[PDB]
Each structure stands twice: as structure tokens, then as C-alpha cells.
Amino acid sequence: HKSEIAHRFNDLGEKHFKGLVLVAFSQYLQQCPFEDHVKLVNEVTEFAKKCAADESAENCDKSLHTLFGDKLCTVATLRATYGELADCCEKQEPERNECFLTHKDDHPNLPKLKPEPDAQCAAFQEDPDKFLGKYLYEVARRHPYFYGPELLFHAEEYKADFTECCPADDKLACLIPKLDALKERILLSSAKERLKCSSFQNFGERAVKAWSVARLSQKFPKADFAEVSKIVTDLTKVHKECCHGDLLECADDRADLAKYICEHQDSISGKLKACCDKPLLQKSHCIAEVKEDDLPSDLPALAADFAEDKEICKHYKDAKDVFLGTFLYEYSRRHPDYSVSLLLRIAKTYEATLEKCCAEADPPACYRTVFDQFTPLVEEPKSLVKKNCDLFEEVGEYDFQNALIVRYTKKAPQVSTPTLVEIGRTLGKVGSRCCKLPESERLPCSENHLALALNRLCVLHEKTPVSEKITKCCTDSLAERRPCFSALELDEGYVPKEFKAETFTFHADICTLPEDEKQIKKQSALAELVKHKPKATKEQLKTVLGNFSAFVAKCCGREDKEACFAEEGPKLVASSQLALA
Numbered sequence: 001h002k003s004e005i006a007h008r009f010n011d012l013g014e015k016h017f018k019g020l021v022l023v024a025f026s027q028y029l030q031q032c033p034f035e036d037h038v039k040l041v042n043e044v045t046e047f048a049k050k051c052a053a054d055e056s057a058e059n060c061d062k063s064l065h066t067l068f069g070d071k072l073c074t075v076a077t078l079r080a081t082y083g084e085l086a087d088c089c090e091k092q093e094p095e096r097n098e099c100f101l102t103h104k105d106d107h108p109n110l111p112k113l114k115p116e117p118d119a120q121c122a123a124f125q126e127d128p129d130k131f132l133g134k135y136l137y138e139v140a141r142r143h144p145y146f147y148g149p150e151l152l153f154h155a156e157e158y159k160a161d162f163t164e165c166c167p168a169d170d171k172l173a174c175l176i177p178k179l180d181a182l183k184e185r186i187l188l189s190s191a192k193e194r195l196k197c198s199s200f201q202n203f204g205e206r207a208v209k210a211w212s213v214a215r216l217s218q219k220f221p222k223a224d225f226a227e228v229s230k231i232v233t234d235l236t237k238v239h240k241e242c243c244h245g246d247l248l249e250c251a252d253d254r255a256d257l258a259k260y261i262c263e264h265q266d267s268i269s270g271k272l273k274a275c276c277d278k279p280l281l282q283k284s285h286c287i288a289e290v291k292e293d294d295l296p297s298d299l300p301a302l303a304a305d306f307a308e309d310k311e312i313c314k315h316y317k318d319a320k321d322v323f324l325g326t327f328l329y330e331y332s333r334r335h336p337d338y339s340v341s342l343l344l345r346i347a348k349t350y351e352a353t354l355e356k357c358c359a360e361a362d363p364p365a366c367y368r369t370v371f372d373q374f375t376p377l378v379e380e381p382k383s384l385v386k387k388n389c390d391l392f393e394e395v396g397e398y399d400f401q402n403a404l405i406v407r408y409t410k411k412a413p414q415v416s417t418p419t420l421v422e423i424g425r426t427l428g429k430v431g432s433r434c435c436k437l438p439e440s441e442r443l444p445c446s447e448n449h450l451a452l453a454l455n456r457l458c459v460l461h462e463k464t465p466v467s468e469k470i471t472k473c474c475t476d477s478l479a480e481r482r483p484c485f486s487a488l489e490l491d492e493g494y495v496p497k498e499f500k501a502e503t504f505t506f507h508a509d510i511c512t513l514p515e516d517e518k519q520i521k522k523q524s525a526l527a528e529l530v531k532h533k534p535k536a537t538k539e540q541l542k543t544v545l546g547n548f549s550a551f552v553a554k555c556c557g558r559e560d561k562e563a564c565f566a567e568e569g570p571k572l573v574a575s576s577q578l579a580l581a
């Protein structure tokens with residue numbers, strides 16, 4: 001292309017071009033204000049228009065990285081606010097772009113997005129474009145690896161809520177649940193896409209391909225190998241581009257990929273009918289979250305080819321990655337009931353068997369029982385899901401969350417209480433989302449969502465490294481992560497935390513808080529109890545936190561609330577030390 005910026009501007013249209021450019025800038029520069037980002041967008045969009053007029057003009061021949069990166073470096077107060085990104089600005093490309101990605105702050109800890117109905121409806125009415133602009137800006141900076149196109153989709157959902165609710169009767173009760181539901185759907189899409197980007201960063205491109213081969217095979221079992229090969233290759237290119245900042249290239253390839261999938265929807269999946277009769281961004285979102293197609297009756301038996309055949313060791317050694325890819329494709333089609341990580345574990349086990357058996361004297365008899373090696377890999381996570389769902393349905397989300405906070409604070413007591421609480425709470429959501437489902441779907445739901453929860457923990461752990469055991473689980477193997485985390489126990493090497501009185505000191509302010517904010521306060525205390533008494537049984541801790549909850553409920557209903565906390569607080573905390581012995 002003679003001018004790439006004009007090419008993208010022409011293809012994407014002005015609205016999406018502007019939107020995606022804003023997101024791109026908002027992700028790299030979290031701290032800068034909205035007013036500043038708008039002008040950068042405006043300036044770029046103008047330049048793109050100039051190039052679209054005359055492609056052989058001054059600087060129009062330059063690459064997107066060059067143009068975007070130069071514009072990033074013009075920003076006012078860049079060295080003061082972003083010392084890291086100012087060091088990058090001196091470099092040429094691609095070194096400078098590579099520098100920018102390294103220094104994206106994976107968590108800035110900005111204020112939580114509190115919906116303000118009246119003021120937002122006011123801003124929505126006066127200028128809806130600038131209002132959606134703020135949505136893009138605010139979400140993008142809170143999630144530096146969010147997918148541009150998918151974020152544009154959630155902006156239309158966001159807008160749809162404000163059109164339905166601002167002229168309507170009660171502004172609070174209309175928006176609040178819709179913007180809570182939207183924020184839940186924002187967190188999940190962010191988590192899914194952060195796993196893909198983390199997988200490139202930590203494990204490389206082959207790990208993303210393998211995950212994608214497995215997931216897509218499950219979703220499109222009717223699709224032949226060549227169609228899946230196309231989709232994976234192209235989808236991996238889309239994901240690689242979005243993760244490495246190339247949002248304009250990502251949007252173009254994503255749309256082209258969704259276009260291909262729908263042109264060939266007959267032969268790929270019956271479930272794509274609804275998705276293909278929809279507009280651009282809606283269509284792509286539907287394909288990505290499409291339900292798995294029903295099992296074809298004519299799925300081939302695999303023992304003949306992958307277990308019984310006499311020349312497997314020959315076929316493996318010719319093209320290892322091709323033979324395993326095929327196995328993975330075929331074995332994933334026939335198992336929607338397995339999780340993605342389980343299928344990759346099974347594939348790694350299959351590889352390992354061939355590596356071993358094709359060194360031995362009689363290979364066929366060795367690898368003849370290769371499928372039976374999978375049994376223990378399948379049974380472990382099945383009964384872990386049953387055990388956790390049995391517990392979840394007994395005690396509910398709050399106590400299930402508490403059971404996991406205890407479980408993980410023991411595994412990693414050196415990790416910060418806010419992190420431990422967050423991860424434990426997210427793991428408890430897996431209980432809510434998966435245990436209600438039909439029992440066949442529990443395993444894939446659980447482990448796939450655990451991959452999101454655990455990658456989040458691993459991302460936070462890069463930011464604040466603490467435990468060597470977590471580093472190992474997070475970095476040794478993508479497929480073995482969840483089993484690795486499960487295999488952790490309390491290390492005796494941890495020195496029990498010293499009993500500061502202020503750590504378990506509650507006051508009247510808790511009573512005014514909402515339900516989840518009360519819980520987080522108690523759950524922070526729960527984690528602090530495990531840090532002080534590592535060896536306390538989970539059953540001891542449950543007793544003690546019950547006494548905390550009661551104490552909170554009691555003093556919140558007292559005449560003099562603060563007098564109750566001041567009086568009963570120290571008494572509870574003193575007797576709690578003894579009860580955890």
C-alpha cells in the first residue's frame with residue numbers, strides 16, 4: 001500500500017477509524033486526560049483525510065507505527081508523566097513500537113467506574129459522540145489489552161442503554177442494573193483477550209495456535225481441517241496484531257475473517273445462522289461467543305490412525321507439529337465436554353508417548369495404549385469440578401469465595417490481601433456461572449474460566465513478584481497452569497505475620513457500605529487471619545469469620561454503633577487469636 005493510513009481510513013470508515021485510534025492512544029497513555037486524547041485523534045484523522053486525497057503527499061507514505069508513534073511522542077508533559085515511554089521516543093522503528101508495548105502499565109488502579117445517571121444522561125444528550133468517546137477512553141485505559149473492535153461493540157451496547165433509559169421514567173433503576181451487567185460483560189471480554197495476549201508474551205505464537213485449534217475444533221466439529229487451518233492462522237494473526245497495538249490492522253483482518261466465516265457458514269457450523277444475519281461488530285462478537293455445533297454422526301474413530309497404525313513413528317518424525325496438530329484437531333472435535341487446557345494436556349501426553357515409544361525397540365506395542373494414558377488426566381479435573389460444585393451449591397457464593405481465599409492465601413501468603421481477595425472472589429464467580437449448567441458442560445466452563453482467573457493472578461504477579469512457586473506455575477507451562485496451582489500447598493518456610501491490632505479493627509463506616517463492599521472488608525480480614533495463622537484449619541477460620549460477621553451485624557444494629565465496635569471489637573480480636581491455634 002502506498003499510504004496505509006489512508007487505506008485503513010477508507011476501509012474502516014471515519015467513525016471506527018476515530019474510535020479505534022482513540023482506544024489505541026488511551027491504552028498506551030492511561031494517565032493523560034480525555035480532552036488531550038481527542039485532539040491527537042482529530043489530528044491523525046485529519047492527516048488520514050489529507051493522505052486519502054493525495055497519497056503522494058508529505059509523510060503519507062510512512063507506516064502506521066511510524067505515524068502513530070510520532071504522534072504519541074508529541075504529547076505534552078510526556079517525560080514527567082511517562083518516563084518509560086519518553087525513553088522509547090528516541091528510538092527508530094520497529095524498536096520504538098517494541099519499547100512502547102513493554103511499558104504498557106497492565107494495571108493503573110484508577111477509580112472504579114461509578115454510573116451517575118443524571119449527569120451522564122445530560123452529557124449523552126448534549127453530545128452523544130463525545131460521550132461515547134469518553135466511554136471508549138475510560139474503558140480502554142482501565143484495560144490496556146482490550147480488543148478495539150470488541151470495545152466498539154460494547155460501546156454500542158452502552159449507547160443502547162442510554163437511548164432506552166434517559167427519556168424513560170426512573171433513571172436510576174433503568175441504567176444501574178444494565179451498566180452493572182455491562183461492566184460484568186466488559187470484565188469477561190477483557191479477561192479472555194488478556195489471556196490471548198499473555199499467551200503470546202509468555203509462551204509464544206504456537207501456544208495460541210494450539211489453544212485456538214482446540215477451541216475452534218470444539219465449536220465447529222462439522223468443519224473440515226482445511227477450513228479450521230485457515231480460521232486459526234487468520235485468527236492468530238488478528239490476535240497478535242491487537243495485542244501488539246495494531247488496532248487498525250486488527251479491525252480490518254477481524255472483519256475479513258468474520259466475512260469469510262459467514263460466506264462458508266453452511267460447511268462450518270449450523271449455529272452461525274443468527275450471527276451472520278447481523279451488522280459488522282455485532283456479527284464478529286456473535287461468532288466469537290457462538291455456541292458449539294452439535295456432534296456429527298460420522299466423526300471418525302481415532303484408534304486406527306493415532307494408536308493402532310504401524311508407521312506412526314515414521315509419520316510423527318516426518319512432520320511432528322503437523323501430526324500433533326491433526327491429533328489435537330480430531331480429538332478436540334469429539335470432546336466439547338473437555339476443557340481447552342485438558343485437550344492440550346492430552347496432546348502433550350500424546351506427544352510424550354510418541355517421543356518415548358519411538359526410541360524403544362518395539363514401538364507399536366508401546367504406543368498401543370496411548371489413549372488409556374489420558375484417563376487419569378480426564379478424571380482429576382472432573383472430580384475437582386464435582387467437589388467444588390458440591391461445596392458451592394451447599395454454602396453459596398460468599399462462603400465458597402471464602403473457602404477459596406483461605407485455600408489460596410495458604411498457597412501464597414506473601415501475595416497482597418487485595419489481590420488474594422480479588423482472585424478468590426473471581427474464582428467463586430466460576431461457581432456461579434458453571435455449576436448451574438448441565439453437568440457435561442461444567443468441566444469446560446470451569447477450567448476455561450479458571451484460565452481467565454489464574455492468568456489475571458499471573459498478570460498481577462508480574463507487576464508485584466512475591467512467590468517463586470507462583471512464578472513457576474505462571475511461566476513453566478500454559479496447559480499445566482491450573483494443575484500446577486492445584487498442586488500447591490502451604491509452605492512451612494513462610495513466617496506467620498505479626499499480630500497488628502489495627503488489621504482486624506472495624507468501625508461504623510462499614511454499615512453504610514453496600515453488600516459486596518461489606519464482604520470485601522470481611523474477606524480482607526479473612527486473608528489477614530490466614531496470614532497470621534497459616535496452620536489454622538479452614539473449619540477454624542469459618543468459625544472465626546462467622547464471629548466477625550455476627551459482630552458486624554450486631555454493632556450495625558446497635559443504638560450507639562461506634563461504642564459497640566470500640567467495646568466488642570478488641571474482645572472478638574483477642575479470642576480470635578486463641579480460636580485459630
Ligand SMILES: COc1ccc2cc(CCC(C)=O)ccc2c1
Nearest residue numbers: 384388427430431434446485486
Ligand atoms: C465450579 O467452580 C470452581 C471454582 C474454583 C475451582 C478451582 C479449582 C482449582 C483447585 C485448587 C486447589 O486451586 C478447580 C475447580 C474449581 C471449580
Ligand SMILES: COc1ccc2cc(CCC(C)=O)ccc2c1
Nearest residue numbers: 399402403406538539541542545
Ligand atoms: C466464612 O468463612 C469461611 C471460611 C472458609 C470456608 C471453607 C469451606 C470449605 C469446607 C468447610 C465446610 O469448612 C466452607 C466454607 C467456608 C467459610
Ligand SMILES: CCCCCCCCC(=O)O
Nearest residue numbers: 210324325347477478479
Ligand atoms: C500441536 C500440539 C501443541 C501443544 C502445545 C501445548 C501448549 C502448552 C504448553 O506446553 O505451554
